[PDB]
Amino acid sequence: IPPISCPENEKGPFPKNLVQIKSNKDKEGKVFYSITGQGADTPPVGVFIIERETGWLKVTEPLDRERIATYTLFSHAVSSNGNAVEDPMEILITVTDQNDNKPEFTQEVFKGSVMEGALPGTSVMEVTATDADDDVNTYNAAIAYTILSQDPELPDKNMFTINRNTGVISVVTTGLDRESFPTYTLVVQAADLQGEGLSTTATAVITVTD
Amino acid sequence: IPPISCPENEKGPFPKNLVQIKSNKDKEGKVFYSITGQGADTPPVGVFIIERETGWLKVTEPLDRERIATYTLFSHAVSSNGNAVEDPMEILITVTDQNDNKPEFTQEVFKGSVMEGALPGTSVMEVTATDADDDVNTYNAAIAYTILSQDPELPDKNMFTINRNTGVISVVTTGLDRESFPTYTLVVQAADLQGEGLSTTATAVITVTD
Ligand SMILES: CC[C@H](C)[C@H](NC(=O)C[C@@H]1NC(=O)[C@H](CNC(=O)[C@@H](N)CC(=O)O)N(Cc2ccccc2)C1=O)C(=O)NC(C)(C)C
Ligand SMILES: [Ca+2]
Ligand SMILES: [Ca+2]
Ligand SMILES: [Ca+2]
Ligand SMILES: [Ca+2]
Ligand SMILES: [Ca+2]
Ligand SMILES: [Ca+2]
Question: Site (Cleavage): which residue positions (chains A, B)?
Answer without folding.
Answer: 207-208
